[PDB]
Structures are given as C-alpha cells and as structure tokens.
C-alpha cells in the first residue's frame, strides 16, 4: 500500500531522548545535553547518572556537623539536586532568596577552606558555591528540587513555623476541582526566571503526592489534598506539560537546555491513585524514591529499600497480597518492582533508582528473625498519625526531627556513618554537637549492634537483641548488589538521599582513636563501578491510531484496576474486523490482564510468569486485542473497551496495528515513519 512520506528529523531533533514529548516546532537545543539518539552526555566519564540530593539545612550555624556545597564529591557525580524550594503564596518557586540570612543566597562560612564566596556573583550562600564548583566541573548538572514531604503543601516561616498554604495542591488545582491554569502559569514562568537567575540546569518536581488515594498526603495537607482527589492527576499533567512548554521555549531562546525531572513514588499503593502516570512523557528523567518502603510510621519491621521481593514482606502478608490468586505472586514493595512499573511509560535510559544514605528503625521489636519481618507497635503517635510503629530513639535516632514541644520524634533515623559507628561499638564524638546528652540512658551505647544481611532482599541491617532494636541500613554490600542490577538492566542511573549521610573512616577523629563520619564511600563505590567497564558483559511504516487508558475511579475504589481503553482511528481507512492491536504492558502487573467487554484481550507474550522472588524476569507482557471479525473501526471513529489488571502500570507503550497482513507502528510513537493514509 502507498504511504505518505515524512521529512526526516534534522539538527537538534536527532538528539531528542526516546519517547520524550517535545514542544512542537520549537527548536529545543537537545544536542547541548544529549547525544544523537538521545542518550545523555554525562559528567566525569560515567555510564550511569549518579544523582545526589544536597540538603540546604546542614549549615553548621547551630554547631551541628555542616555539609556544604564544597563537601560534595563533584568528581564522582553527574547531577546534584538542591533540596528544597517550595511553592510560595503567589504560586511561585521560592527559596526565600530575599530573606536576610537565608542559606541559599545570603550566608557565608568565614574560615572554612573551600567555602569562600565569589564576590562577582549577586548572591552568597549555597548557590554561590554551586556556581563556582560547576566551573571546575562543567559537565555536572544542578537542579532545583521543589516540594518534598514537609513543603509540598506549605512552607516554613522565619520562626520555623509551617504555613499551611496548600503548596502544589492549591497551585495545580482550584478549590472547585478545576485545574488552576493561572497558578501553573505563574509557577512555570517563575521556574524559568529562577533557572536563569541562579544558573541551574533544571527543575526537579518533588510533589508528594498527586494521587487520588484518600489520606495519602502529609497529614498536614489533608484539608487540601482530600478535597482534590479526583482532580490531582489532571492538575499534575497540566503542571508538567506547561513546565515542559515554558522550559523548551526558554531553552530555544537561551541556546542552552533545561531539564525537567521528578522525584516519583515507588509505592504501589500511591501509584494506584495515579492512573497511568501520563505525565512521564514530559520528564527528561525520573528519580524513583525506592526507599522509605518501610519505617516506623507503622509496625511492620523490615528493609527501608529492598531490591527484591522475598515472598515474606510482613505488610504484604497482612493484606493478603501473596495469597490472592489475581496478584500472581507478585510482591511490589521493592526497587525492582518500581523500576518495572516506570518502564511502562519510559525507556530505561530515563529512569534512575533511589537508594538511602540514612537509616530507619524500630525499638521493642517482637517476632521476625533478628527483627526482620517482626512487629513493633508504638504509642503516642506523631501528629497526624492514628497508629504508628515504636520508632527507635536517642543514640538510635540522631537525625531526628523535633515536634512542636521541642521533643525528639522517634523513628530510628541516622546518617550511615553513625550506623557504621554503632556496628563498631562507637557512640560517636559528634553526639553533643547534635544537642544529644550522652549521659542520658537512651543516648548511651547498650547491648551489641549485630550486622545482618539478606541477599534475597539486598538488605543490610543492625539488630540489637538486648534492646530489640532493628535499624535498616545501606552499605557497600547492598550498594554493590544494586549497582550490578543497575548495570545489567542498563538503568539510567542511581539517585541517593542525601549527600551528608555518606561515610568514611576518619582515623584522627575521637582523640586519634578514630570513628566514621561524613565521607564518600558509597558514592565512590557507585562512581568506580559506573566509570569503568561493566563486571558482567521493527515496523517500517506507521498508522495514526491513538490509544489511551482513562475513566479511572478514585484510588481507594480502584480494586481491581479497571480503566477504559479508547482506540481512535485517525487514518482515512476503515480498519476491518480482525485488525489486531498489540502493546507492551509493564511486568509490574501480573500477566493476567483481560477485558470486560467480550473482546478477548490477552497476553500473547509473557515477559514474567510465576513469583517475582529474585526479581521480575522481563520488562513487558505483550498484549493483543482484535476488533471482532464482524466489527470495523471507521475513519475518524473510536471504540472503547473495559480492561482489568491487578497492580499499577504506566504507559502502556510500543503499540502496533496489524492490518491486512502488515504490521504498523503508530504515529504517536513513530512520527517519522512513512504512514498509511488510504488503503
Ligand atoms: Cs575510558
Ligand atoms: Cs570536595
Ligand atoms: Cs572564590
Ligand atoms: Cs576570591
Ligand atoms: Cs520522600
Ligand atoms: Cs527528611
Ligand atoms: Cs498473603
Ligand atoms: Cs557488633
Ligand atoms: Cs527520604
Ligand atoms: Cs565480562
Ligand atoms: Cs464485544
Ligand atoms: Cs515479552
Ligand atoms: Cs526465582
Ligand atoms: Cs532478562
């Protein structure tokens, strides 16, 4: 059949990342950051992204250990995310740059070698140092992260009090449930101005979370989030599409490229309320928050960031996930599952998986095996929680937050250097600097912290049998195991929270006796692995047929997941009955996807079968559905069918249309192939 010829891509279009949505007609300068074919030009000779979160609040001004921009391992990273900007009362991106003494732009560190201010920049603070060091390391990108858990829905004032402004929720969705175009425009324009002003290379959206699951947000945000559940997906897609548009236009004007990234949830629960993550097409890449999968907000004691399911996750067992036939023995609270979820709508090159450089932990743990998959129920829950685990405290919780009364909030949160000292039987000479009285019982080292490791989970932890304390850790053994998995799956890279938690042995500390402290062991392991060779070694025509899943219920009602699939014929040909549509569904969902409309939709190629212990065994389950023999799809017309699947997916992707003996790609995915207009 004759096809319609399309002009081939030229110039910058030859460097567009695979599947990234470009702003039509705008000369976006992709080749400034990407290679031909769309792979990223990465700093320091690395094969993988190595993305470190830098937190703004470790300035050392209160006497606690500082971690400054000059302490960053610039020669071993590819990207640095600055945490956090927020959405202010005028819906603009803000770091309180105009507040006297603010750490971003109005702070200095006299006498600290390497932290000297460049007098030629019209700002001081962290940003001054970031600008300076980027000159020495010109390939390293900086991005401004916006939101996070505490400031997704509000922001802190000068007195440390939180203003419940609504943040992302009110900026993206009006109180009446419609998308807030004015707010999204103000924010997007402000992001462009911010990038231009401070020399950032991109914006990292850390909206926690645009999900329709009830009570999923920070409890402090529920009056905003719960009122918007049905609208948050549309609001988030509008935010990302508009941000993409404004940054693409700015990039074309400035002759340099601006990235949009997002910190995105690993939780299958959160994702159940996020439709198919339609917004992925706007993102240069995602940073998957494959950590805080378990923690003392509930009683289920286990790894913070398991790589794999082991069939024994105590939380999943409690909810009957392993035993329900429909779930096909897929357990989802793990890094591998989350990665495979995001491949539904992204190539591997645009996904980076997160790891923690910090601990979470419980005390008074019962059951389990050396605490693993045990139980720890707590009392006097943190504000907003109606149940909690018994979070570890004192010497087991040195990176705690404080409540309004100035009291430590339990949770077993520590930098990994402190966890390494506990393992060694060292209390840490820095305790007093954190305002921790080392003479108090809860702040003394009692019992023995025994390191455990589970290779099925790629998870280390400390178990203190005397205190019944379980601290989930991350160290060289688990990083090496995850790094192997990254390389073998050719994943885009690795993200970590946070730089200040990485460690080294410091022989001179502790009166010359030595202890662990701030360092670069884990980042160095990642870099050394990814900058050297790995340890281990299509349709020619298209048709304009469109596919989309929609009609999702509110998240709490989305069991099982049964959206409507709409197929639209935008060719000038009638698709005869028997025409076959295929597409890839990520293996995050069991390979039992079906339709409820009598179409006979089924998996024709299973990338994964059986339990996912030891990891999912492939990327995609390819699905086929045919028009019934008697039913055509006319030019310009649509047909819908109800589908059902059992765990969240993004995408789908990689569509083909099987028409009169020939297989076509679709123009939405393959815009430069010659295409079928008439047949
Ligand atoms: Cs090389
Ligand atoms: Cs350094
Ligand atoms: Cs300087
Ligand atoms: Cs200087
Ligand atoms: Cs988070
Ligand atoms: Cs935090
Ligand atoms: Cs179960
Ligand atoms: Cs020990
Ligand atoms: Cs975190
Ligand atoms: Cs090899
Ligand atoms: Cs039917
Ligand atoms: Cs497959
Ligand atoms: Cs297996
Ligand atoms: Cs494989």
XYZ file of C-alpha atoms and ligand atoms in Angstrom:
693
model
C 0.000 0.000 0.000
C 1.218 3.528 -0.853
C 2.425 5.525 2.147
C 2.784 9.217 2.935
C 6.386 10.389 3.227
C 7.524 12.386 6.246
C 10.542 14.747 6.349
C 13.321 13.121 8.447
C 14.476 14.651 11.750
C 17.347 17.126 11.453
C 19.553 19.170 13.749
C 18.550 19.089 17.406
C 15.699 16.672 16.727
C 18.330 13.973 16.161
C 19.248 14.219 19.865
C 15.784 14.063 21.432
C 15.569 11.441 24.225
C 13.498 8.391 23.291
C 9.751 8.967 23.829
C 10.215 12.476 25.275
C 7.390 14.838 24.363
C 8.823 17.837 22.528
C 7.090 21.194 22.265
C 6.034 21.192 18.598
C 8.046 23.425 16.281
C 10.290 24.897 18.983
C 13.991 24.500 18.209
C 14.802 22.835 21.525
C 18.610 22.557 21.846
C 18.789 18.842 22.734
C 22.291 18.403 21.345
C 23.633 20.660 24.096
C 22.951 17.900 26.665
C 22.153 14.772 24.630
C 23.937 12.649 22.035
C 22.490 11.681 18.684
C 19.932 9.058 19.636
C 19.010 10.860 22.842
C 21.371 9.406 25.463
C 22.640 11.965 27.969
C 26.152 13.402 27.845
C 27.209 12.536 31.396
C 29.865 14.144 33.585
C 33.076 12.506 34.770
C 33.031 9.687 32.212
C 30.176 7.853 33.913
C 27.967 5.280 32.154
C 25.155 5.966 34.646
C 23.588 9.001 36.246
C 24.780 9.483 39.817
C 22.383 11.965 41.344
C 22.937 13.301 44.839
C 20.441 15.265 46.896
C 22.050 18.180 48.727
C 20.016 19.436 51.679
C 20.028 23.151 52.494
C 19.784 22.846 56.248
C 23.181 21.457 57.308
C 24.830 24.870 57.520
C 26.547 24.170 60.821
C 25.419 27.523 62.238
C 23.853 25.871 65.306
C 27.046 23.920 65.974
C 25.933 20.615 64.435
C 28.031 18.997 61.661
C 27.895 21.055 58.468
C 27.693 19.694 54.961
C 28.432 22.432 52.453
C 28.499 22.554 48.660
C 32.286 22.407 48.948
C 32.000 18.969 50.641
C 30.238 17.412 47.645
C 32.212 14.781 45.671
C 31.959 16.781 42.445
C 34.348 14.494 40.546
C 32.169 11.434 41.202
C 28.647 12.718 40.423
C 26.635 13.610 37.328
C 23.755 15.614 38.873
C 23.095 17.477 42.124
C 19.579 18.228 43.335
C 19.208 21.115 45.781
C 16.582 20.462 48.475
C 14.247 22.308 48.818
C 12.473 25.117 47.055
C 8.740 25.443 47.735
C 5.651 26.894 46.081
C 5.010 30.225 47.759
C 1.786 32.150 48.408
C 1.921 33.678 44.931
C 2.358 30.217 43.391
C 5.980 30.932 42.537
C 9.065 28.793 43.002
C 10.880 30.111 46.110
C 13.848 29.506 48.391
C 13.159 32.718 50.346
C 16.041 34.270 48.421
C 15.090 37.716 49.785
C 15.123 36.697 53.462
C 18.169 38.007 55.354
C 20.434 35.146 56.395
C 18.806 32.547 54.137
C 21.184 29.642 53.356
C 20.565 29.597 49.579
C 21.714 33.142 48.806
C 22.613 35.067 51.975
C 25.007 33.042 54.086
C 28.769 32.671 54.304
C 31.243 30.421 56.092
C 34.280 32.504 57.155
C 37.438 30.469 57.644
C 36.089 27.295 56.064
C 38.574 26.276 53.372
C 36.911 25.716 50.012
C 33.745 27.590 51.002
C 34.951 31.078 50.042
C 32.395 33.306 48.311
C 32.831 34.525 44.742
C 32.426 38.291 45.102
C 31.361 38.578 41.447
C 28.028 36.784 41.955
C 24.997 38.793 43.141
C 24.198 36.140 45.746
C 26.051 34.336 48.508
C 25.079 31.103 50.275
C 24.948 27.555 48.902
C 24.122 28.887 45.431
C 27.338 30.917 45.199
C 29.410 27.792 45.908
C 27.354 25.682 43.456
C 28.039 28.203 40.690
C 31.749 28.247 41.496
C 32.272 24.491 41.601
C 30.366 23.957 38.361
C 33.114 25.959 36.639
C 35.641 23.354 37.751
C 33.270 20.503 36.845
C 31.402 21.800 33.748
C 29.614 18.546 32.984
C 27.919 18.250 36.364
C 24.285 19.415 36.339
C 22.466 21.218 39.138
C 18.693 21.091 39.535
C 16.394 22.849 41.984
C 14.101 20.395 43.790
C 10.679 21.742 44.695
C 8.455 20.282 47.418
C 9.372 17.237 49.469
C 7.345 15.758 52.321
C 7.229 18.885 54.506
C 6.877 21.583 51.848
C 4.727 20.014 49.150
C 1.684 21.635 50.765
C 3.105 24.627 52.608
C 6.306 26.365 53.664
C 8.199 27.321 56.805
C 8.289 30.902 58.067
C 11.147 32.858 59.655
C 10.278 31.453 63.095
C 10.312 27.827 61.951
C 6.505 27.602 61.925
C 4.781 25.976 58.949
C 2.323 27.998 56.850
C -0.457 25.728 55.541
C -0.765 27.475 52.175
C -1.641 24.438 50.044
C 1.585 24.449 48.014
C 1.405 22.177 44.968
C -2.191 21.175 45.730
C -3.631 24.680 45.517
C -1.200 25.752 42.784
C -2.310 22.953 40.428
C -5.994 22.543 41.341
C -8.538 25.210 42.281
C -10.727 24.702 45.333
C -13.621 23.833 42.980
C -11.777 20.901 41.442
C -10.783 22.502 38.138
C -7.142 22.746 37.075
C -5.512 26.003 38.225
C -4.137 27.378 34.938
C -3.192 30.727 36.476
C -1.255 29.066 39.303
C 0.524 26.675 36.950
C 1.441 29.547 34.617
C 2.804 31.638 37.489
C 4.832 28.716 38.761
C 6.214 27.728 35.357
C 7.246 31.264 34.447
C 8.862 31.616 37.891
C 10.853 28.413 37.316
C 12.251 29.797 34.061
C 13.238 33.036 35.815
C 14.812 31.115 38.709
C 16.907 28.883 36.439
C 18.128 31.934 34.519
C 18.937 33.876 37.688
C 20.951 31.257 39.551
C 22.351 29.172 36.708
C 20.516 25.930 37.481
C 20.274 23.373 34.666
C 16.808 22.113 35.504
C 13.881 21.765 37.879
C 13.133 18.630 39.906
C 9.462 18.379 40.857
C 9.035 16.595 44.197
C 5.247 16.780 44.571
C 4.304 14.360 47.376
C 1.829 13.380 46.069
C -0.536 13.978 43.137
C -2.515 10.845 43.921
C -6.237 10.193 44.269
C -5.719 7.841 47.267
C -7.503 9.323 50.284
C -5.211 10.408 53.183
C -2.090 9.683 51.128
C -0.651 13.152 51.598
C 1.264 14.604 54.536
C -1.452 14.732 57.238
C -0.804 18.491 57.422
C -2.045 18.729 53.808
C -5.254 16.668 54.010
C -7.631 19.647 54.018
C -6.165 20.463 50.595
C -5.372 17.052 49.183
C -8.505 15.134 50.156
C -10.678 17.885 48.650
C -8.925 17.459 45.292
C -8.504 13.685 44.890
C -10.389 13.405 41.599
C -8.535 16.338 40.048
C -4.919 15.836 41.086
C -3.992 13.697 38.093
C -5.236 16.301 35.585
C -3.578 19.039 37.628
C -0.243 17.246 37.629
C -0.328 16.513 33.917
C -1.162 20.180 33.280
C 1.729 21.264 35.520
C 4.270 19.069 33.715
C 3.002 19.886 30.210
C 3.165 23.614 30.940
C 6.565 23.402 32.608
C 7.836 21.464 29.567
C 6.451 24.127 27.240
C 7.947 27.066 29.150
C 11.336 25.442 29.641
C 11.500 24.325 25.985
C 10.786 27.877 24.797
C 13.301 29.344 27.264
C 15.917 26.810 26.115
C 15.393 27.797 22.487
C 15.767 31.469 23.420
C 18.824 30.911 25.640
C 20.649 28.431 23.426
C 21.078 26.004 26.314
C 18.922 23.123 27.504
C 16.801 22.942 30.681
C 15.853 19.567 32.147
C 12.641 18.682 33.967
C 12.875 15.792 36.364
C 10.634 14.457 39.105
C 11.033 12.547 42.328
C 8.355 9.897 41.910
C 6.907 7.321 44.312
C 7.994 3.671 44.385
C 4.870 2.722 46.383
C 2.333 0.563 44.556
C -0.268 1.971 46.939
C 0.376 5.599 45.928
C 0.563 4.665 42.251
C -2.860 3.015 42.376
C -4.227 6.565 42.509
C -2.053 7.948 39.709
C -3.827 6.462 36.660
C -1.059 5.509 34.178
C 1.350 8.338 35.082
C 0.550 10.045 31.779
C 2.905 12.868 32.809
C 6.031 10.726 32.284
C 6.280 11.858 28.647
C 7.230 15.393 29.777
C 10.127 14.371 32.011
C 13.753 14.201 30.950
C 14.028 11.512 33.604
C 12.549 10.351 36.891
C 14.227 9.755 40.237
C 12.328 6.866 41.756
C 12.033 7.118 45.548
C 12.715 3.428 46.101
C 13.346 3.941 49.796
C 11.166 4.561 52.852
C 9.280 1.433 51.756
C 9.172 0.519 55.463
C 9.647 2.719 58.532
C 8.321 3.466 62.000
C 5.168 5.208 60.765
C 3.818 1.659 61.020
C 4.547 -1.569 62.850
C 5.990 -3.690 60.032
C 9.703 -4.086 60.700
C 11.772 -4.517 57.557
C 14.192 -3.067 54.992
C 13.925 0.568 54.011
C 14.815 -0.134 50.377
C 14.636 -3.830 49.454
C 15.871 -4.538 45.915
C 13.605 -7.588 45.521
C 10.543 -9.287 46.947
C 11.376 -12.386 49.089
C 7.801 -13.634 49.407
C 7.789 -12.747 53.107
C 7.110 -8.984 53.392
C 5.097 -8.854 56.627
C 2.989 -5.917 55.436
C 2.077 -7.588 52.146
C 1.249 -10.794 54.032
C -1.028 -8.891 56.403
C -3.013 -7.509 53.447
C -3.194 -10.976 51.822
C -1.215 -9.861 48.766
C 0.776 -13.079 48.301
C -2.231 -15.341 48.753
C -4.770 -13.684 46.444
C -4.709 -15.580 43.120
C -5.247 -12.461 40.971
C -1.910 -10.952 42.045
C 0.022 -13.878 40.556
C 2.519 -13.992 43.441
C 3.918 -10.580 42.598
C 5.084 -8.662 45.670
C 5.528 -4.945 44.995
C 7.302 -3.243 47.933
C 10.717 -3.312 46.301
C 13.031 -1.389 43.980
C 12.813 -3.946 41.168
C 9.004 -3.700 41.040
C 9.045 0.105 40.981
C 11.617 0.170 38.175
C 9.457 -2.166 36.128
C 6.405 -0.013 36.796
C 8.118 3.050 35.310
C 9.270 1.150 32.206
C 5.624 1.035 31.181
C 5.918 4.653 30.072
C 9.698 5.292 29.950
C 12.804 3.792 28.352
C 15.382 2.513 30.866
C 17.601 5.477 29.971
C 15.074 7.889 31.533
C 14.738 6.041 34.850
C 17.032 6.374 37.888
C 16.515 4.347 41.055
C 16.901 5.869 44.518
C 18.886 4.480 47.447
C 19.082 5.824 51.022
C 22.223 7.044 52.787
C 20.291 7.001 56.063
C 18.521 4.534 58.350
C 15.018 3.965 59.643
C 14.476 1.886 62.745
C 12.222 0.458 65.460
C 12.659 -0.469 69.129
C 10.861 -3.140 71.159
C 10.614 -5.382 68.094
C 8.932 -8.777 68.540
C 8.606 -11.716 66.158
C 10.597 -11.959 62.945
C 14.142 -13.282 62.591
C 16.794 -10.978 64.033
C 13.959 -8.440 63.824
C 13.328 -8.940 60.102
C 9.585 -9.007 59.330
C 8.889 -8.602 63.024
C 6.406 -6.227 64.610
C 6.824 -3.040 66.608
C 3.721 -1.126 67.671
C 4.199 2.351 69.100
C 2.408 4.715 71.458
C 1.654 8.441 71.411
C 1.847 8.637 67.616
C 3.393 11.577 65.743
C 0.919 14.366 64.947
C -1.468 13.295 62.199
C -0.918 9.544 62.611
C -3.641 7.369 64.186
C -1.312 4.397 64.513
C 2.472 4.075 64.463
C 5.409 1.773 64.964
C 7.667 2.132 68.015
C 10.411 4.272 66.472
C 13.961 3.907 67.754
C 15.169 6.815 69.871
C 18.183 8.598 71.330
C 21.517 7.212 70.128
C 19.462 5.210 67.600
C 17.819 8.326 66.142
C 20.377 11.132 65.900
C 18.958 12.694 62.726
C 15.504 13.073 64.296
C 13.077 15.899 63.688
C 11.563 17.744 66.659
C 7.864 18.143 67.424
C 6.265 21.475 68.361
C 7.213 20.974 72.021
C 10.856 20.586 71.008
C 10.837 16.857 71.740
C 12.536 14.215 69.588
C 10.239 12.393 67.151
C 11.107 8.637 67.226
C 11.989 6.828 64.004
C 15.484 5.333 64.057
C 16.844 7.933 61.603
C 20.635 8.193 61.346
C 23.303 9.014 58.765
C 25.084 5.858 57.602
C 28.329 6.985 59.274
C 26.542 6.813 62.607
C 25.173 3.343 61.776
C 28.734 2.278 60.918
C 29.931 3.529 64.318
C 27.135 1.665 66.127
C 28.205 -1.508 64.298
C 31.745 -0.848 65.548
C 30.597 -0.229 69.119
C 31.380 3.501 68.941
C 28.910 6.117 70.178
C 30.176 8.981 68.025
C 32.051 12.049 69.286
C 29.557 14.280 67.435
C 26.581 13.438 69.685
C 26.902 16.569 71.824
C 27.040 18.702 68.661
C 23.541 17.406 67.820
C 22.333 18.528 71.248
C 22.264 14.923 72.402
C 23.234 14.485 76.059
C 25.482 11.387 76.023
C 24.895 10.847 79.764
C 21.197 10.055 79.315
C 20.224 6.334 79.228
C 18.620 6.481 75.756
C 21.773 8.170 74.437
C 24.231 5.572 75.698
C 25.502 2.560 73.783
C 23.961 -0.559 75.326
C 23.997 -4.116 74.005
C 25.559 -5.041 70.680
C 24.559 -3.931 67.181
C 24.989 -7.026 65.012
C 25.105 -6.532 61.248
C 22.824 -8.830 59.275
C 22.470 -9.204 55.530
C 19.804 -10.784 53.375
C 20.878 -11.370 49.762
C 17.342 -12.147 48.592
C 16.424 -8.598 49.610
C 19.842 -6.991 49.046
C 19.318 -5.539 52.519
C 21.681 -4.999 55.463
C 20.543 -4.107 58.954
C 21.621 -3.855 62.540
C 19.921 -5.995 65.152
C 20.447 -5.176 68.810
C 18.992 -8.171 70.650
C 19.411 -6.526 74.041
C 17.304 -3.501 73.075
C 15.243 -5.361 70.473
C 16.266 -2.585 68.063
C 16.208 -3.063 64.268
C 17.940 -0.402 62.158
C 17.628 -0.707 58.391
C 20.918 0.266 56.773
C 22.525 0.659 53.350
C 26.228 -0.026 52.871
C 28.876 -1.272 50.469
C 27.448 -4.773 50.140
C 23.932 -3.653 49.209
C 25.143 -0.777 47.034
C 27.336 -3.240 45.090
C 24.401 -5.607 44.639
C 22.096 -2.770 43.478
C 24.826 -1.375 41.236
C 25.167 -4.743 39.499
C 21.402 -4.732 38.944
C 21.569 -1.188 37.502
C 24.268 -2.140 35.024
C 22.692 -5.443 33.996
C 19.329 -3.773 33.296
C 21.017 -0.733 31.715
C 19.015 1.526 34.015
C 19.572 5.258 33.580
C 21.325 5.590 36.905
C 21.131 5.931 40.664
C 19.834 8.731 42.882
C 20.519 8.993 46.621
C 19.162 10.887 49.611
C 21.278 12.524 50.956
C 24.912 13.515 50.345
C 25.590 14.264 54.030
C 24.774 10.680 55.023
C 27.650 9.053 53.102
C 30.644 7.996 55.185
C 34.398 7.477 55.577
C 36.663 6.237 58.341
C 38.356 9.219 59.977
C 41.441 7.994 61.851
C 42.179 11.324 63.558
C 38.682 11.800 64.998
C 37.757 10.722 68.537
C 41.094 11.777 70.069
C 43.038 9.868 67.418
C 41.191 6.623 68.120
C 39.076 7.076 65.004
C 35.408 6.839 64.014
C 33.202 7.059 60.938
C 31.990 10.472 59.853
C 30.928 12.363 56.744
C 32.591 10.930 53.648
C 32.176 9.457 50.193
C 32.470 5.649 50.431
C 29.115 4.759 48.852
C 29.224 7.415 46.126
C 32.817 6.380 45.384
C 31.708 2.769 45.010
C 28.928 3.817 42.632
C 31.279 6.021 40.610
C 34.096 3.462 40.447
C 31.606 0.847 39.273
C 29.907 3.040 36.655
C 33.006 4.788 35.176
C 34.828 1.535 34.361
C 33.703 -1.366 32.133
C 30.779 -3.452 33.498
C 31.750 -6.530 35.555
C 29.230 -8.584 33.600
C 29.060 -8.410 29.812
C 10.596 -3.126 13.960
C 7.810 -1.701 11.768
C 8.913 0.330 8.772
C 5.545 2.047 8.401
C 3.099 3.736 10.748
C -0.618 4.462 11.019
C -2.302 7.227 13.022
C -4.250 5.213 15.572
C -4.447 6.586 19.103
C -4.623 4.642 22.368
C -5.362 5.742 25.924
C -6.497 4.351 29.270
C -8.922 6.550 31.190
C -12.070 6.597 33.305
C -10.172 5.653 36.458
C -12.114 5.674 39.722
C -10.782 7.397 42.832
C -7.840 5.389 44.109
C -9.487 3.698 47.081
C -12.120 2.301 44.676
C -9.542 1.168 42.111
C -9.529 -2.517 43.145
C -9.087 -4.162 40.720
C -7.768 -1.571 38.295
C -10.374 -1.290 35.548
C -9.979 1.752 33.289
C -11.499 2.096 29.845
C -9.247 1.659 26.799
C -10.159 4.059 23.988
C -8.851 3.403 20.481
C -9.233 6.129 17.854
C -8.742 5.660 14.123
C -7.242 8.897 12.742
C -6.378 7.399 9.377
C -8.615 7.785 6.315
C -9.006 3.992 6.138
C -11.603 1.695 7.666
C -9.952 -0.834 9.981
C -11.625 -4.158 9.138
C -12.828 -6.628 11.741
C -9.949 -8.852 12.784
C -7.498 -5.924 12.853
C -5.024 -6.688 15.670
C -3.758 -4.206 18.229
C -0.753 -5.101 20.378
C 1.113 -3.196 23.071
C 3.562 -3.723 25.933
C 2.259 -3.750 29.499
C 4.990 -3.499 32.139
C 5.516 -6.591 34.293
C 4.595 -4.563 37.379
C 1.128 -6.022 36.701
C 0.589 -9.789 36.668
C 0.275 -11.287 33.197
C -3.456 -11.943 33.571
C -4.706 -8.649 32.138
C -8.075 -9.077 30.426
C -11.030 -7.098 29.135
C -14.600 -6.981 30.464
C -16.262 -6.228 27.140
C -16.023 -9.647 25.500
C -13.161 -8.612 23.165
C -10.828 -11.413 24.297
C -7.843 -9.204 25.181
C -4.968 -11.376 26.401
C -1.227 -11.674 26.911
C 0.427 -13.178 23.838
C 3.969 -12.914 25.181
C 4.668 -13.115 28.901
C 7.888 -11.446 29.979
C 7.213 -12.628 33.500
C 5.445 -15.657 34.956
C 5.294 -17.009 38.493
C 6.576 -15.400 41.669
C 8.886 -12.362 41.426
C 11.204 -13.618 44.142
C 14.688 -12.841 42.838
C 13.257 -10.158 40.567
C 10.800 -9.795 37.700
C 12.055 -11.911 34.784
C 11.355 -9.471 31.955
C 10.246 -5.920 31.119
C 6.942 -6.466 29.323
C 3.967 -8.674 28.861
C 2.829 -8.056 25.300
C -0.952 -7.900 24.981
C -3.160 -8.492 21.932
C -6.724 -7.431 21.314
C -8.521 -7.708 17.976
C -11.546 -5.998 16.529
C -14.189 -8.738 16.344
C -14.416 -10.312 12.917
C -17.740 -8.512 12.363
C -16.758 -5.104 13.702
C -14.859 -2.426 11.784
C -13.455 0.864 13.064
C -14.263 3.675 10.652
C -12.044 6.614 9.728
C -12.181 9.245 12.473
C -14.113 6.921 14.786
C -13.455 5.476 18.244
C -14.140 2.235 20.072
C -13.828 1.602 23.812
C -13.370 -1.472 25.972
C -13.067 -2.016 29.699
C -9.834 -3.690 30.754
C -8.857 -5.147 34.118
C -5.452 -5.648 35.713
C -4.299 -6.059 39.299
C -1.277 -3.868 40.052
C -0.464 -0.375 38.758
C 1.103 0.254 35.347
C 2.375 3.262 33.437
C 2.078 3.593 29.676
C 1.288 1.234 28.015
C 3.762 1.634 25.143
C 5.106 0.117 21.917
C 1.807 -0.138 20.063
C 1.353 -1.949 16.779
C -1.586 -2.249 14.424
C -1.894 -5.469 12.435
C -3.812 -4.550 9.315
C -4.406 -6.737 6.244
C -1.247 -8.790 6.778
C 1.116 -5.917 7.597
C 2.238 -4.597 10.986
C 2.350 -0.830 11.580
C 3.740 1.300 14.373
C 1.560 4.214 15.453
C 2.363 7.807 14.550
C 2.112 8.899 18.209
C 5.269 6.862 18.861
C 6.857 6.809 15.419
C 6.198 10.236 13.843
C 8.897 9.993 11.152
C 7.915 6.668 9.569
C 6.038 6.839 6.261
C 2.376 6.358 7.135
C -0.824 4.851 5.843
C -3.433 7.424 4.892
C -5.512 5.363 2.454
C -5.680 1.603 1.858
Cs 37.524 5.470 29.180
Cs 35.341 18.099 47.648
Cs 36.381 32.376 45.416
Cs 38.036 35.117 45.811
Cs 10.104 11.156 50.187
Cs 13.764 14.316 55.959
Cs -0.558 -13.348 51.888
Cs 28.958 -5.539 66.676
Cs 13.948 10.293 52.228
Cs 32.992 -9.517 31.490
Cs -17.862 -7.471 22.163
Cs 7.763 -10.050 26.113
Cs 13.242 -17.339 41.320
Cs 16.211 -10.571 31.237
